[PDB]
Amino acid sequence: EAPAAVVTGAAKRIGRAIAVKLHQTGYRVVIHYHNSAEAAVSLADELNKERSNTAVVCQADLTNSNVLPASCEEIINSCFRAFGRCDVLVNNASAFYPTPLVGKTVETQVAELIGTNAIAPFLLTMSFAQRQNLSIVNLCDAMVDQPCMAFSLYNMGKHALVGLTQSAALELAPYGIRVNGVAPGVSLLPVAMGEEEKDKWRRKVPLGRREASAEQIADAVIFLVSGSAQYITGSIIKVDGGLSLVHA
Amino acid sequence: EAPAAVVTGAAKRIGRAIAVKLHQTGYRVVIHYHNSAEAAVSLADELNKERSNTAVVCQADLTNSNVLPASCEEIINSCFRAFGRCDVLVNNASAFYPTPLVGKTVETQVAELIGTNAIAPFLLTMSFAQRQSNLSIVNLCDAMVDQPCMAFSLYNMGKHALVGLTQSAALELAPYGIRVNGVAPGVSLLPVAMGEEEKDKWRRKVPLGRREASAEQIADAVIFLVSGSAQYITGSIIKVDGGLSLVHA
Amino acid sequence: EAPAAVVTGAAKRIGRAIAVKLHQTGYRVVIHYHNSAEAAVSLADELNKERSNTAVVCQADLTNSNVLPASCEEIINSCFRAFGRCDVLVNNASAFYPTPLVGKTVETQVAELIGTNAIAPFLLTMSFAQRQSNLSIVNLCDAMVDQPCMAFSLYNMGKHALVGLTQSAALELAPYGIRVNGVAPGVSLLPVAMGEEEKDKWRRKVPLGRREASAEQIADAVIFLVSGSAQYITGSIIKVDGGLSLVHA
Amino acid sequence: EAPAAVVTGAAKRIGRAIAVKLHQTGYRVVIHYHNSAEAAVSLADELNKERSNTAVVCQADLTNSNVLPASCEEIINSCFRAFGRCDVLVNNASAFYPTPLVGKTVETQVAELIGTNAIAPFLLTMSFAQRQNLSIVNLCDAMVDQPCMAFSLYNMGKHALVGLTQSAALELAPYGIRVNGVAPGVSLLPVAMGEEEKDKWRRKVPLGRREASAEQIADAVIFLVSGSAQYITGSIIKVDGGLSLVHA
Ligand SMILES: NC(=O)c1ccc[n+]([C@@H]2O[C@H](COP(=O)([O-])OP(=O)(O)OC[C@H]3O[C@@H](n4cnc5c(N)ncnc54)[C@H](OP(=O)(O)O)[C@@H]3O)[C@@H](O)[C@H]2O)c1
Ligand SMILES: NC(=O)c1ccc[n+]([C@@H]2O[C@H](COP(=O)([O-])OP(=O)(O)OC[C@H]3O[C@@H](n4cnc5c(N)ncnc54)[C@H](OP(=O)(O)O)[C@@H]3O)[C@@H](O)[C@H]2O)c1
Ligand SMILES: NC(=O)c1ccc[n+]([C@@H]2O[C@H](COP(=O)([O-])OP(=O)(O)OC[C@H]3O[C@@H](n4cnc5c(N)ncnc54)[C@H](OP(=O)(O)O)[C@@H]3O)[C@@H](O)[C@H]2O)c1
Numbered sequence: 005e006a007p008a009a010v011v012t013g014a015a016k017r018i019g020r021a022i023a024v025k026l027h028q029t030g031y032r033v034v035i036h037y038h039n040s041a042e043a044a045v046s047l048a049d050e051l052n053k054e055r056s057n058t059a060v061v062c063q064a065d066l067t068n069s070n071v072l073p074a075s076c077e078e079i080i081n082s083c084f085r086a087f088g089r090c091d092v093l094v095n096n097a098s099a100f101y102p103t104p105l106v107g108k109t110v111e112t113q114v115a116e117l118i119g120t121n122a123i124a125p126f127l128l129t130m131s132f133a134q135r136q137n138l139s140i141v142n143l144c145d146a147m148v149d150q151p152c153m154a155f156s157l158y159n160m161g162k163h164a165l166v167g168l169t170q171s172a173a174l175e176l177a178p179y180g181i182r183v184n185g186v187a188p189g190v191s192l193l194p195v196a197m198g199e200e201e202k203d204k205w206r207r208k209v210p211l212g213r214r215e216a217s218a219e220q221i222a223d224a225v226i227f228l229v230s231g232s233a234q235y236i237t238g239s240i241i242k243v244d245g246g247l248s249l250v251h252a
Numbered sequence: 253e254a255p256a257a258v259v260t261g262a263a264k265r266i267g268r269a270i271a272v273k274l275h276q277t278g279y280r281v282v283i284h285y286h287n288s289a290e291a292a293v294s295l296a297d298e299l300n301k302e303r304s305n306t307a308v309v310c311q312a313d314l315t316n317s318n319v320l321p322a323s324c325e326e327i328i329n330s331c332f333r334a335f336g337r338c339d340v341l342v343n344n345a346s347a348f349y350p351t352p353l354v355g356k357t358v359e360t361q362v363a364e365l366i367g368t369n370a371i372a373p374f375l376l377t378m379s380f381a382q383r384q385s386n387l388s389i390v391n392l393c394d395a396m397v398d399q400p401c402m403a404f405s406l407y408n409m410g411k412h413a414l415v416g417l418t419q420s421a422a423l424e425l426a427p428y429g430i431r432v433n434g435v436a437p438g439v440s441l442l443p444v445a446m447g448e449e450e451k452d453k454w455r456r457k458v459p460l461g462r463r464e465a466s467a468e469q470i471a472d473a474v475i476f477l478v479s480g481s482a483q484y485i486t487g488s489i490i491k492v493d494g495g496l497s498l499v500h501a
Numbered sequence: 502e503a504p505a506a507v508v509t510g511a512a513k514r515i516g517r518a519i520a521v522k523l524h525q526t527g528y529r530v531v532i533h534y535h536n537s538a539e540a541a542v543s544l545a546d547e548l549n550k551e552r553s554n555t556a557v558v559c560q561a562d563l564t565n566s567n568v569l570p571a572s573c574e575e576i577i578n579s580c581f582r583a584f585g586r587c588d589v590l591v592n593n594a595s596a597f598y599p600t601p602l603v604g605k606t607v608e609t610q611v612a613e614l615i616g617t618n619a620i621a622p623f624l625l626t627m628s629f630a631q632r633q634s635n636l637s638i639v640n641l642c643d644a645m646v647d648q649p650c651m652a653f654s655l656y657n658m659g660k661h662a663l664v665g666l667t668q669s670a671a672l673e674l675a676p677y678g679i680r681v682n683g684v685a686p687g688v689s690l691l692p693v694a695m696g697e698e699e700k701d702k703w704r705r706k707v708p709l710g711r712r713e714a715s716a717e718q719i720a721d722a723v724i725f726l727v728s729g730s731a732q733y734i735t736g737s738i739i740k741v742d743g744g745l746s747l748v749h750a
Numbered sequence: 751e752a753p754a755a756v757v758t759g760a761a762k763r764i765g766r767a768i769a770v771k772l773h774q775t776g777y778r779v780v781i782h783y784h785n786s787a788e789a790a791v792s793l794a795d796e797l798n799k800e801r802s803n804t805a806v807v808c809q810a811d812l813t814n815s816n817v818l819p820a821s822c823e824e825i826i827n828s829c830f831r832a833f834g835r836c837d838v839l840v841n842n843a844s845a846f847y848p849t850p851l852v853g854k855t856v857e858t859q860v861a862e863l864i865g866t867n868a869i870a871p872f873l874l875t876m877s878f879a880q881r882q883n884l885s886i887v888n889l890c891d892a893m894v895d896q897p898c899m900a901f902s903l904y905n906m907g908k909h910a911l912v913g914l915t916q917s918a919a920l921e922l923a924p925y926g927i928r929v930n931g932v933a934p935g936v937s938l939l940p941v942a943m944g945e946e947e948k949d950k951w952r953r954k955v956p957l958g959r960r961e962a963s964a965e966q967i968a969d970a971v972i973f974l975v976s977g978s979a980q981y982i983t984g985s986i987i988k989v990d991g992g993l994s995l996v997h998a
């Protein structure tokens with residue numbers, strides 16, 4: 005039987021590309037979502053039209069709370085429910101917005117940014133491991149050491165996620181579970197963002213003066229979960245077209 | 253007027269060393285504590301006997317909660333209440349224990365490990381800036397963050413977040429003249445519950461001396477980072493590990 | 502038409518697995534060697550037996566000297582002479598031996614270690630770029646560069662230099678469509694000379710499988726980096742170390 | 751009796767600041783120079799005026815060659831002959847210039863950039879140790895991982911120096927010798943650089959929109975060689991005003 009993968013925030017953009025490429029490679033997928041029900045099912049329909057009963061959806065808020073552990077336990081369960089196995093976990097879901105040091109309460113910002121980018125990936129990892137070419141891939145950020153201004157919580161989240169990638173690689177290696185990361189720089193920009201401000205970020209990218217397509221990010225994910233990366237663990241692959249190498 | 257510092261978890265060990273050294277340097281100190289009331293009060297006694305009206309104690313739980321912001325805001329408030337100013341903040345307080353991936357609830361482990369090592373520093377940092385000359389923050393990090401102990405995922409994630417904060421905070425608060433730096437022990441004072449055999453196993457790994465760092469040795473680097481000799485230093489983590497992080501498996 | 506690749510030190514061990522896998526992927530290969538004449542010619546034969554006119558050998562000493570630029574210019578020239586193009590450069594050749602601080606002269610050690618591991622890669626990158634599709638360079642680095650073996654400073658200085666090259670070359674050659682990246686083994690193929698308890702000592706330390714990387718596992722990452730699945734990857738060093746660099750002392 | 755320091759390229763700018771602060775701390779100093787004999791001599795006189803017989807100068811080209819090892823052995827030897835001891839070694843001398851990938855020969859650029867920045871520090875280290883609060887301090891570069899364009903050989907030099915620092919810390923720790931680095935970001939700008947170009951770099955620095963004075967860099971070196979840094983080794987202290995944290 006075909007292996008099975010969980011992709012968090014898989015309904016749109018980069019997570020959608022991961023789930024599609026994983027499916028095109030022959031995985032059965034769990035498309036997690038929070039708000040994008042319509043887009044998630046739409047993706048599942050497309051994938052299932054290709055091969056019947058190879059894509060299911062799963063809803064969960066990934067914000068930190070007393071219920072988070074149980075939601076993450078159940079995302080992993082849905083993969084075992086649908087497919088009888090869970091070979092791959094891609095922690096892609098992420099909140100990202102500014103939290104100046106000098107309207108959500110700060111405690112809610114903590115809950116969303118630290119929960120989605122860090123704690124939920126920790127809890128999903130716990131449940132993944134407990135339930136067992138098994139690997140985990142975490143969507144990190146190649147700009148962590150040169151962070152966006154006023155983004156300290158988000159940024160604290162992605163650093164926490166780098167530490168979890170490393171800790172979990174060390175601890176889960178005895179179980180044959182590899183744990184790795186993929187770090188975009190500028191991939192798909194928010195439709196929210198202004199076009200002028202978009203081309204400002206694009207022009208900074210040495211390799212082609214453009215952003216990464218979502219497929220380019222998914223390519224790194226595909227490599228990491230493959231047989232070609234079977235000695236690779238605790239590694240984080242930058243996919244940033246040299247953006248992080250560029251001084252101020 | 254003498255400047256004033258806040259040191260979190262300052263009742264004993266390394267935070268005591270920081271507070272004492274900051275006090276010997278001429279600072280007034282808020283000794284923040286959680287459970288260690290007698291040790292906190294004993295230390296504020298010692299320091300006030302040295303210079304009257306120069307040490308207070310301040311109780312707070314730094315576990316993450318929806319009341320954490322308020323608690324951190326009050327820690328900073330207490331320094332202004334006592335001393336009319338707050339020049340320096342040392343984020344020393346830290347919970348530290350295993351959380352294996354395979355009777356505390358996981359929700360509580362998240363709250364204590366992430367709260368003490370990362371969210372309280374963020375919140376204290378926020379409160380410190382908004383209440384505002386040589387202003388600086390020093391975060392107690394960990395030199396072994398990239399070669400972590402087995403099954404310390406949460407603690408390690410919180411120390412990594414602390415590195416992230418140090419950097420983001422240094423960047424954002426530089427315009428306000430606040431510097432933000434770190435001090436990363438490898439092995440310093442070992443746990444009180446640890447047995448001497450297990451301590452010596454760690455001691456024997458340190459290239460420089462085959463011994464742990466003293467609390468004064470850690471405190472020395474913090475005192476450098478707050479001084480006028482570090483006036484251009486920000487976003488920097490100073491490793492104080494006797495070469496331990498260079499030693500391969 | 503088939504693209505072509507240069508692999509330094511490709512007669513044996515890891516560079517040989519690299520050249521074999523490039524060739525299976527469809528590349529024509531220049532097999533560079535220094536002393537391993539017999540092995541190099543044997544490899545070209547096997548590759549050519551499989552697909553005709555797809556492999557040449559090229560001899561060069563990559564020790565630093567005033568003629569090293571010319572030699573490196575000639576290794577790149579040999580690919581154009583043989584195949585009409587040069588698409589891929591792999592910097593694999595490396596001297597590796599201890600150089601304690603406290604019968605080769607120090608002048609020679611500096612020359613072999615820094616030349617093979619850094620200066621030759623720099624000069625090759627220069628000639629490659631100047632002679633100029635999916636063009637890319639992969640340098641063979643070392644995952645233990647921050648946790649070096651004792652008394653291996655010149656070697657370690659060379660590997661660090663190689664990281665600096667990867668990044669500086671990635672930045673500068675980006676506007677030319679040339680990507681530059683790295684593959685950093687931990688313990689892979691273990692030395693001929695090394696005793697057998699030393700090998701098992703190193704093997705026990707590897708979290709993932711308690712074994713060293715096969716030559717082919719290292720080559721897989723090189724192959725990924727030069728493929729059309731890495732078109733946005735530049736200035737990245739991929740560890741292929743079974744988690745070894747994560748194990749504390 | 752008073753301890754003694756060797757400082758390389760100590761005649762001008764940053765190295766001169768380091769020599770002076772060491773001397774003010776109570777060190778006797780070997781002022782090394784290559785071309786700047788008048789400034790070296792000028793410093794030694796100033797310093798000997800303060801304290802009789804506490805400053806000497808010592809000339810040596812630090813470009814890589816087959817005589818380099820002998821030259822570095824003689825710099826160390828000069829401190830022993832003059833003062834009877836060599837407690838501190840500061841590796842400050844640095845060639846710095848572009849070497850684009852696409853009127854010196856390239857082999858000479860290699861020899862100057864790699865020799866001054868990396869090989870001479872390694873030979874000076876060998877000799878320092880062989881001859882024995884003992885410490886070495888290397889002048890590194892905060893911008894090593896975000897290099898200036900077309901500075902690959904310089905950048906290769908500074909990276910090697912980080913590795914030396916680490917390798918030397920580990921190997922000389924049993925002899926009680928600590929090895930550390932100080933990494934400037936933007937410090938003293940070349941005097942002949944136009945103020946308008948100087949200002950483009952200044953403006954990039956978060957902490958105060960200015961470059962570090964030489965004395966500011968010297969301050970960190972002073973720290974590292976003091977009794978206040980006695981457990982510190984293998985460490986590189988950035989002195990950069992937050993410059994390296996600033997994204998493109
Ligand atoms: N795009 C870039 O340039 C870039 C750069 C650096 C790093 N990254 C990383 O790459 C990954 C994917 O990036 P992206 O731009 O595709 O992400 P994105 O659009 O910002 O977010 C992806 C998904 O995360 C889910 N999500 C947000 N908040 C959630 C919550 N509270 N609970 C559960 N799910 C939640 C959302 O799902 P729903 O719509 O279903 O609610 C969203 O569609 C992220 O980890 C990101 O941090 C991206
Ligand atoms: N010791 C080392 O070898 C070492 C190594 C690497 C890094 N570090 C770092 O250096 C720092 C100092 O080390 P240390 O060993 O002296 O620390 P520690 O004794 O383990 O902890 C210091 C203090 O943190 C406070 N704390 C714990 N949980 C708290 C909570 N929920 N709320 C508020 N305060 C809490 C405790 O205060 P109360 O007693 O008053 O309850 C404790 O006295 C820490 O940041 C540590 O991570 C130390
Ligand atoms: N093997 C590992 O565990 C390991 C670990 C970390 C990093 N690496 C890196 O991965 C690469 C491959 O490893 P490996 O073990 O296969 O390497 P290796 O066997 O030690 O050396 C590869 C080739 O380098 C060539 N070489 C040595 N000195 C030379 C010189 N002066 N001039 C020109 N060529 C010279 C030799 O060619 P000839 O035989 O023709 O003389 C040799 O076959 C190296 O870059 C190494 O640094 C390997």
Ligand SMILES: NC(=O)c1ccc[n+]([C@@H]2O[C@H](COP(=O)([O-])OP(=O)(O)OC[C@H]3O[C@@H](n4cnc5c(N)ncnc54)[C@H](OP(=O)(O)O)[C@@H]3O)[C@@H](O)[C@H]2O)c1
Nearest residue numbers: 759763764783784785786812842843844889934936937938
């Ligand atoms: N200034 C900065 O913004 C900055 C930034 C980053 C890092 N740094 C680091 O801090 C250190 C000092 O910087 P700096 O600007 O003061 O230095 P600098 O002016 O560029 O040079 C320092 C001295 O190096 C000596 N030197 C140059 N080539 C030499 C050679 N072939 N042999 C022997 N000595 C040679 C020169 O001595 P003579 O004049 O006597 O010939 C020169 O005065 C360097 O290691 C540098 O890389 C500085």
Ligand SMILES: COc1ccc(CSc2cc(N)nc(N)n2)cc1
Nearest residue numbers: 098099100145152190191192193194
């Ligand atoms: C720095 O300017 C940018 C670049 C990319 C984006 C894409 S939205 C996004 C980005 C991210 N790093 N994480 C998450 N979750 N979502 C937004 C602003």
Ligand SMILES: COc1ccc(CSc2cc(N)nc(N)n2)cc1
Nearest residue numbers: 346347348394401439440441442443
């Ligand atoms: C590696 O084995 C050790 C070494 C030192 C200690 C000291 S207790 C401690 C340590 C820490 N990194 N953070 C906090 N908060 N407390 C415990 C276990």
Ligand SMILES: COc1ccc(CSc2cc(N)nc(N)n2)cc1
Nearest residue numbers: 595596597643650688689690691692
């Ligand atoms: C002391 O531990 C080891 C580990 C691997 C080896 C393989 S031989 C080798 C290694 C290398 N880093 N570079 C080169 N060129 N060849 C030898 C000793």
Ligand SMILES: COc1ccc(CSc2cc(N)nc(N)n2)cc1
Nearest residue numbers: 844845846891936937938939940951
């Ligand atoms: C921002 O562009 C600059 C900044 C400072 C300088 C001072 S000269 C210098 C610089 C250096 N890193 N190393 C050495 N040896 N010399 C020149 C250009």
